[PDB]
Design a protein around this ligand. Structure first.
Ligand SMILES: Cc1cc2nc3c(=O)[nH]c(=O)nc-3n(C[C@H](O)[C@H](O)[C@H](O)COP(=O)(O)O)c2cc1C
Ligand SMILES: Cc1cc2nc3c(=O)[nH]c(=O)nc-3n(C[C@H](O)[C@H](O)[C@H](O)COP(=O)(O)O)c2cc1C
Ligand SMILES: Nc1ncnc2c1ncn2[C@@H]1O[C@H](COP(=O)(O)OP(=O)(O)O)[C@@H](O)[C@H]1O
Ligand SMILES: Nc1ncnc2c1ncn2[C@@H]1O[C@H](COP(=O)(O)OP(=O)(O)O)[C@@H](O)[C@H]1O
Ligand code: SF4
Ligand code: SF4
Lengths: 729, 729
């Protein structure tokens, strides 16, 4: 039963001519579908509609070809073909009684236009601080009228597509905000200077959009109320609140964010730096002066926090993006009082990293069905029930093993999950202990909670933790119909890395002065004062250990052969991470790797040290002059973060003795997660989810085909268009 | 008439059961089309078929979902949908009497599989040196059987699609090469160790493919004969030649390359480092031991060079990739003796940069129609003729103005091209003078040659160089019906940059100790010993100037607020560029920018110097602790490379006096190229080509829409498939 305190979250709220059934609102957010993958777009949004969310929005939607984000993927409302594709989403969302919204976007120079090759226009000419080679043309008065017209035309197509909510997008430093912000706007005419002038472009656009579709659609505006850069850009109590007062009568609802685009991690707060509700100080400032419904994201996943902001008058609606990805059924579970079934977002930003990389579909660390709803037919809360009585033994309870266990149990199988470790979680139990990664434990907390309750539904299922390591013989005679090996991976101990694919002479983590990430995290092995971290990995391990060690008083130097924290650019953690390492005085030696290690010292070299000229000098000799940049640096302790290797000995033994499987009535043994190949936690979780869903297929080791959303030759995107080659001659 | 010496280039050559009509062969190369953009794929290849190329190949073609290059785009031959889409290309190519080929690809860990989420397999487990977070599973004997079967199935699907040539792709360190190369292969079974064991995987695969389609298709293999890393990887005179001897009986033709994947710029040699025929020393070693037709790329654009390699026995066929993109009609022009009509590739690698970025379609600096054949209907050699007598005045003869002039003249308009400069080329004349960029001149040599020739066909047209700068009055009273302003851009002189969008206090290129790129290239202003280059641009200017000054004896330090030469990662010039700067002792100070400048000194700061923690402290106050990393550095001369701005003064005046156009019989004035917004030379060229093609449209300032190749909701990619959402429950 739902706690009566949460009843307020289920009261309807009027937004202009529309009514939200409850206070759960999915703000606009990327998923890697746009108007190019209609199935993905409709399935992902409609499951949330089924899940109870009051309104579902598309991601930023380009109003015209001159605002093309390629290589990144945005939605598009350019023509009739887009209207058709996007309607599939509004139709499916309406089916479950929810509203559908679109976020009208024009990016200025922030849009690289790599597909269209068109020229972006802006208030003044500038080179984007995000897309450094992208420049825009300064707009004259007719340019302004024309772009405003693009918005009107787009709003009209949106109504045709079935959208109930139309946004004039002014967050993440996009067009309307560029005119408002002096950082971009250097004009001296009526569209620049004073706030009245700087606000003019936005005010006129809102008015024109309202005039065109305001009777049929709710007009909302997304606004970056503070750029969080201090004086120089937008400040909430200066221009921020004043603009709200000015535009209040034209808008039906305010959707608030903070930050710009280069650092939008200030908005999409990674759990590494920000807790739930991190945006409250800025968001509440809007309610204070607005007379319209206000909402502002803040990684809300806890109903207690949700009621707090609402009853305290900080917001009227609960806007979420990531929380809705991790759990499309969040509203329903709160309504039904099923608090323990809520799959809480861990704020890892891996979903976002996909958008930033440009082009690939979204994936989620918690929800392995995100992005898979349409192409694989995986509903996050509905599982195909087994008709047989097969039992499954799962060796390893990490992200992959525990997810496979959870899905199989949900499907009705009898499962036996075992691990030598005392708790479910595998390597993730160590990872969440790294500085700032505490919330990543929700991944294992959820699986622990779920597996425990699922055990009550089938007494033949068993959970055996803190056990002795399973052996080949133990597995063969266990008596399970099928076996899933999810034994994980370990960090290399001999220097093996992606640059050479070979060990490094002198690297041995069993030595007193060398450690692996595991040895550092266990905290038993002593670590000297001067620490050198040798890195060949582009994600979080090296910087996280550097932070941990520096805060403990060690002198840290990171020698990196690959771009340090590269992947963190995509998760939006990079800027604050660099600032953190800087305040801790961590020295970084990029573009360098190690050729040999000795006790207390190592020889490093610049990776660009070979001669620039290539000459054919015959066999046995390099075609470039020798690298002579080698130099030795000393250390008290050397931490090796060179790469990982699959722990697949058990698997290898079982495979060698495959002929014995039949004799023991073993129908199949499958290898998943890091034990198959070291992966991102999200993908490790996915492999477990997949073998569980496809356990009855011919070969669960390899995935069955998924529906592909690619154009079919002979079918034009434009209704009634000619698909054939036509040269203009 | 064609020079008799070039007759040999038109002799047919037998490759297995197929015959090449001449020696012009387009090797496989990316274009950003794959199987996702069938129109782009068929049009781009067929124009070359019409241009006389004997055979046209697709780019690398994935044989199975576990070799998915997303975010990069490759062709795919996974199912019937792909066969349908790819057949569009083979049909169109056959229409012009040419053969079509497909390059079967399996990438190992080099394929990040971001769309499929599948696990790649390889000879041993390793983390790709290219995709550092991508690991593969070590293959057992059944894995090997299964992957070889993938190739067979792909080959069979290829034959169904109408391909005449089927490749087993073993270049760029892909699968077959991974088994042959000790760098990847650490196996101890019959597939590792000795050369015969290392070659086993490739040999078996070739044999199975030949057996499956060898009677209907020619079997070719692409091979990286030398990884150009010296001992440790493949060496031409060691394993290289021997593998050729072993496989010779199985292949119908050898397609040779050099280098790996991380640095394939060694293969696709940038003119900055390599001249035409740079691969010869390696390629010739193959013909030395082979009995089958050999071909090896080398940026061949000159017929004199083409006949040299053939008559000297270095190769039997002329394989080209880039030269075919710059000029789809290269073969026909040679055949007809029209040597001066050949549009020579400048080896800028901008086409390639688009593939590396991942997702965007290809563009060409020389050929503005590349990628536009299908979507815009632009044929590179056919222009729609005008039916009126309009004359067009073009102010500025740089990349944009000269291309607009060329296309207008080809279309039959009377054109008046003028510039204050002595010759055609604009800023490109200074750029080609930078160290190693000499071949970029071909862009202006081509336009100079064509314009000169086109003037002869219309005596009303005129070329006026070395003139006084055109003023608004001059333009208004000139007498032309339409005017095109192509006045270019200039580098900023006040420190204005993408980071702040404002000038830097103390920045003034008129002072004796500060210079702009133009001042450095003119070589008149004196430059002191210690030079500091302040950079905020991510392409070639800062590195090139640094090289130029260092070779001249100056002590150079580059202070960069953006990732130095980032765009060069995409053009494949980065590795050799960094080695060059290192040899020249150029110091780099990344992650730093400039707050203020004084005579002989500048104050710099670390861009990550602000506090990592964000706290709301009200208006007027920054939410982060202040950056205190500021320090002063000295210099004798400071070179400013902070950004560019459009030179649009003339345009602005004309627009202000728009009311005067009608009375002077001026129908319209258009702004193109860098004057509209600083662009890459390729896009500047594109703007000129576009206004020219659309001069008769309602508004030539804005492009008319192009055909979009996006799926239409309601049409499944799989023929006979269901497009509706279907959950597996
Ligand atoms: C995968 C992803 C992509 C995003 N892209 C958009 C976008 O298209 N448009 C937009 O206005 N905001 C975008 N957002 C930002 C979200 O709207 C939101 O402001 C952010 O995720 C914080 O909300 P949350 O803390 O509830 O996730 C994106 C967020 C996510 C998760
Ligand atoms: C735009 C582009 C993409 C490429 N992609 C491929 C590819 O898919 N498969 C392949 O084997 N080679 C690829 N290449 C490499 C070319 O096949 C060729 O080896 C290289 O460009 C050198 O030939 P050229 O000097 O005549 O251009 C690519 C080259 C270009 C120009
Ligand atoms: N022989 C074994 N018997 C039981 N548990 C094992 C055995 N070998 C490894 N494990 C357990 O398997 C788990 C693997 O988890 P983890 O490394 O997180 O992998 P993944 O990320 O693939 O889920 C670890 O908790 C480890 O204790
Ligand atoms: N007022 C003018 N009259 C004539 N030519 C001009 C005038 N202003 C600039 N130019 C010329 O216009 C040309 C612009 O070329 P460029 O900078 O290469 O631009 P783009 O790359 O756009 O073609 C330069 O050669 C410059 O001399
Ligand atoms: S990928 Fe991570 S941050 Fe994104 S919704 Fe999932 S758990 Fe949340
Ligand atoms: S973009 Fe450059 S390197 Fe590529 S085909 Fe064109 S001129 Fe050649």
């Amino acid at each position: 039963a739902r706690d009566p305190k949460h009843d307020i979250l289920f009261e309807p709220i009027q937004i202009g001519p529309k009514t939200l059934r409850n206070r759960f609102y999915q703000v606009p957010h990327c998923i890697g579908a746009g108007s190019d993958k209609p199935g993905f777009q409709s399935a992902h949004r409609s499951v949330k509609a089924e899940g109870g969310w009051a309104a579902l929005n598309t991601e930023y939607c380009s109003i015209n070809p001159e605002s093309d984000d390629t290589h990144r993927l945005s939605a598009r409302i350019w023509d009739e073909g887009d209207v058709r594709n996007l309607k599939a989403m509004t139709d499916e969302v309406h089916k479950y009684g929810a509203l559908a919204g679109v976020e009208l976007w024009y990016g200025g120079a922030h849009a690289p236009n790599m597909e269209s090759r068109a020229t972006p226009r802006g208030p003044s000419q500038y080179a984007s601080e995000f897309e450094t080679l992208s420049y825009c043309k300064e707009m004259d008065l007719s340019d302004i009228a024309q772009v405003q017209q693009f918005y009107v035309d787009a709003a009209k197509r949106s109504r045709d597509a079935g959208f109930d909510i139309v946004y004039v997008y002014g967050a993440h430093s996009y067009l309307p905000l560029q005119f408002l912000n002096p950082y971009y706007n250097k004009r001296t005419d009526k569209y620049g200077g004073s706030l009245e002038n700087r606000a003019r472009f936005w005010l006129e656009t809102l008015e024109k959009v309202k005039h065109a579709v305001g009777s049929d659609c709710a007009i909302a505006t997304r606004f970056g109320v503070d750029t969080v850069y201090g004086p120089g850009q937008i400040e909430a109590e200066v221009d921020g609140q004043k603009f709200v007062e000015m535009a209040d009568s034209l808008v039906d609802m305010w959707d608030i964010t903070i930050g710009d685009i280069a650092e939008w991690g200030e908005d999409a707060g990674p759990s590494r730096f920000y807790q739930q509700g991190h945006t409250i100080p800025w968001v509440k400032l809007v309610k204070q002066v607005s007379k319209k419904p206000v909402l502002g994201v803040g990684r809300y996943t806890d109903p207690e926090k949700m009621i707090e902001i609402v009853t305290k008058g900080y917001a009227d609606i609960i806007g979420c993006a990531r929380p809705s990805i991790a759990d499309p059924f969040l509203p329903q579970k709160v309504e039904q009082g099923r608090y323990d079934d809520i799959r809480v977002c861990i704020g890892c930003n891996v979903c976002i990293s996909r958008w930033e990389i440009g082009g690939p579909p979204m994936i989620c660390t918690q929800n392995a069905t995100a992005g898979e709803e349409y192409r694989r037919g995986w509903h996050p809360e509905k599982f195909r029930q087994t008709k047989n009585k097969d039992s499954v033994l799962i060796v390893g309870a990490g992200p992959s093993g525990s997810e496979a266990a959870r899905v199989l149990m949900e499907s009705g199988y009898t499962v036996h999950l075992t691990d030598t470790a005392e708790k479910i979680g595998g390597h993730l139990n160590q990872v969440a202990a790294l500085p700032g990664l505490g919330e990543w434990s929700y991944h294992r907390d959820y699986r622990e909670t779920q597996i425990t309750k699922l055990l009550k539904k089938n007494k033949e299922s068993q959970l055996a933790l803190g056990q002795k390591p399973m052996t080949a013989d133990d597995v063969l005679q266990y008596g399970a119909d099928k076996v899933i090996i999810a034994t994980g991976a370990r960090w290399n101990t001999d220097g093996t890395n992606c640059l050479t694919h070979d060990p490094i002479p002198g690297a041995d983590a069993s030595l007193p002065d060398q450690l692996t990430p595991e040895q550092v995290m266990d905290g038993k092995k002593k670590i000297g004062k001067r620490v050198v971290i040798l890195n060949a990995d582009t994600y979080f391990m090296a910087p996280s250990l550097a932070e941990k060690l520096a805060t403990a008083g060690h002198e840290v130097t990171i020698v990196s052969g690959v771009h340090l924290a590269n992947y963190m650019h995509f998760t939006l953690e990079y800027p604050n991470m660099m600032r953190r390492l800087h305040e801790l005085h961590v020295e970084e030696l990029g573009d360098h790797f190690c050729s040999r290690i000795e006790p207390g010292r190592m020889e490093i070299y610049n990776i660009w040290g070979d001669g620039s000229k290539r000459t054919y000098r015959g066999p046995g000799v390099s075609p470039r002059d020798a690298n002579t940049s080698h130099r030795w640096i000393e250390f008290d302790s050397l931490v090796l973060v060179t790469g990982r290797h699959s722990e697949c000995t058990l698997w290898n033994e079982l495979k060698a003795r495959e002929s014995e499987w039949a004799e023991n009535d073993i129908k199949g043994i499958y290898l998943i997660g890091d034990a198959e190949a070291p992966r991102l936690i999200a993908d490790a979780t996915f492999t477990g989810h997949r073998v569980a869903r496809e356990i009855e297929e011919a070969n669960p080791q390899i995935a069955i085909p998924y529906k592909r959303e690619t154009i079919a030759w002979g079918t034009p995107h434009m209704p009634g268009g000619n698909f054939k080659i036509e040269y203009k001659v």
